[PDB]
Symmetry: D2
Subunit: 238 residues, 4 copies
């Protein structure tokens, strides 16, 4: 009812595995037509296969969120074949933090500004930003993780204010320690130490991030905007 | 009858359920299949709750509960246990006044939460959800009261979530902004227009729109969300 | 023939609770060093006598008294005594928090004590149209889960409390601020095994424990006239380790 | 005492910047204040002279790698390394915030070599004074996280990095504000008044002192009790 996304087109970047894949499946399951992206032709073909195997109408595409040209072209392709995406989920050393965060926010900003025209026309939108998963070792890692998270929060809160009068919401999801291919390959010691800091005593599932995204994308979340919802089993960092 | 991904057969306790946000929450949990026990402080309010639930096809009851009283809490829970089973979803709903107000709210949450925890601990499953106050008065006293309550609620929610997390019980809160309620309808027209201008969405929130967030947090999909305060405020953030 | 100090708090009376050791003692010495007349408190006669001796040994004019911040009577009586003998305390540092399902009762008890003491001292500050109330948060003392829960709860309650009281009293030129210590060096943490120490320090960008004096300096500043537009703030003093 | 220390304060020709330069001077620092025009830099030199403060006034464009490097070199030749650096000079929310942080990062990275050598430093970032609310909150969030991160990167070198978040301060921008906006602002400030530029400077002076050595990664709000989310 509120939870139906029937008749909506959703763009989910970095959808070939993990949290991205799970998000694309959840939006599909809720009735959306889903366009998942990857950076390689191989990843984009994998996305198309996964969507087919789950009954989800849509497609898999190649997108480089760092490139104005790729963005504009990808959106054009979506417009030609399926219509305007009105749900967009952005998923995709210690001197590094400043350049990393800056690059992420430019990518969000590029993609968000591009998809906004269609949302502005429609007078309806959902932009949802996925923060980074926990598990990078040492002080350099924690520095990079906290910087990214602070930049994402403020970015999300600001963009929400800019576009709010158009009935477009902008929210973010801050994952904690989630069971993914990248975290499975973490050394066992780092993992056990992470696990011990989580009140729920387990890793989160990728589906458990996707469910939050699915809700935020629904009509029932229409008065939620500028928010960063943490999904972390009770483990909070400053 | 055996449920899957639904609130069916779960018993939910929603306090202050006679009107506004509380009522809407009770209806949403009912709609999602829960057996719902709504509470009020008066016999009259509790009867109103029972009627409203009946009129909407929701199985459950309306009861009298004084969350300031250890006796009333224990007695109310016993009655629920006898008739319907242990409530595994619990929604707590309800410038020099701020200290007493916040203090009283948190003692009431703590009392009720501690009481319902034994049943959740046995079941190895639970959902406690705390509703913050609505943005309800325009002056300085109001904004002070609202920010104090909200800060106390956030930290309380985060702490309890840590205490009970290992038992697969989640504890979250919902921080409403400016919601269309009897309290806010009676605000002067001049204050309303000035309110709306501080809200990016340009409108009041509906009580249903708080209830939908609560319904989601109560679901299985929200199992990895705990200690969180979800703001539902149309983009107006105020501390 | 009377000696007039040129220090920032000359001619002010300061009340510092829980002043018998650690951060409290250091705060009392700093305010004294900055020229304040200083009344340090403890819960026992022996602690109050220790305070008086320490103050005397450091050239600080003032006293050591017994105060139980959990008791309305003790608070009122202690204030009256201070008024009679030395004058109204217009700088008040609340240090004396407790410790030891426990988090809720601890935090609640602290905030009632702050509120009691703050309300009592406010009459003198309201008359004077000037005040400084400064609340000291708890030291990082437990690295598990129960400890981190207690520490974050206390800190959140203190922050909102501080911010709210600041609003209530602001129009009277009284400021209300808090100081949130991180890992501060004490006799108990020096005796931690060398292995646990190195692992702790690796969480702190500065790579060292804070000194009690380093909390006291921040308190001394917030107490000054230059800090008059700082109110409702919680200043973290933690060497860059932020945890919540 | 900041006796024997060299301080670089950008945007020092008026307001908060000027007051910061005078406070650091008063505390004994040799002070280099910057402005974007020759005229502003000359004004700074005059103001410093008139107050007994040793130092200089220079032209600096924090958006330019060349100007930064050259300015530092000039300071090094004549006075020695600045070990206290106050970034005051800042300037569609997205482009503004991004530009500020690049400037902070540029200037901070440049001054860090001298601080790393000395094994001592103080970097202090001044936030913006109170569409507008969006810009202000974005800037403040970016500043906080920036300040907290840089503090972690440089902490082991006994360099602290902190920020000051002003509220409604009596300055050129705010003097021109309409009476209606002012009165509405005052009513949201518990202290019931504007802050003085000196009152920001005093916080900066303290953060620059040895007694603030265990404070790092902090943003100290100086706003009379008015807080915005
Ligand atoms: C642009 C816009 C907005 C923000 C940040 C940027 N740019 C950067 C760049 C680096 C960085 N490090 N930590 N944060 N941060 N932020 C946050 C509020 C909106
Ligand atoms: C009173 C006033 C205010 C606050 C808290 C209380 N009382 C309690 C009591 C318990 C508790 N646990 N976590 N927080 N918390 N707070 C914070 C905002 C102002």
């Amino acid at each position: 009812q509120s939870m139906s996304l029937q008749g909506k087109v959703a763009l989910v970047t970095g959808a070939s595995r993990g949290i991205g894949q799970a998000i694309a499946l959840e939006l599909g399951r809720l009735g959306a037509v889903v366009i998942g992206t990857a950076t390689s032709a191989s990843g984009a073909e994998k996305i198309a296969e996964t969507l087919k195997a789950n009954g989800v109408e849509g497609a898999g595409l190649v997108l480089d969120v760092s490139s104005d040209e790729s963005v504009a072209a990808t959106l054009e392709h979506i417009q030609q074949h399926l219509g305007q995406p009105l749900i967009v989920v952005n998923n995709a050393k210690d001197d590094e933090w400043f350049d990393v965060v800056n690059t992420n926010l430019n990518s969000l900003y590029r993609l968000s500004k591009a998809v906004l025209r269609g949302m502005t026309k429609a007078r309806w939108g959902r932009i949802i930003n996925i923060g980074s998963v926990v598990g990078a070792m040492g002080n350099a890692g924690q520095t990079n993780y906290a910087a990214a998270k602070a930049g994402l929060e403020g970015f999300t809160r600001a963009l929400a204010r800019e576009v709010g009068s158009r009935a477009i919401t902008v929210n973010a999801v801050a994952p904690g320690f989630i069971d993914t291919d990248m975290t499975r390959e973490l050394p066992e010691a780092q993992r056990e130490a992470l696990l011990g800091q989580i009140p729920l005593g387990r890793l989160g599932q990728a589906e458990e991030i996707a469910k939050v995204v699915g809700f935020l994308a629904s009509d029932g979340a229409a008065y939620v905007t500028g928010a960063t919802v943490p999904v972390n089993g009770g483990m909070y960092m400053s």
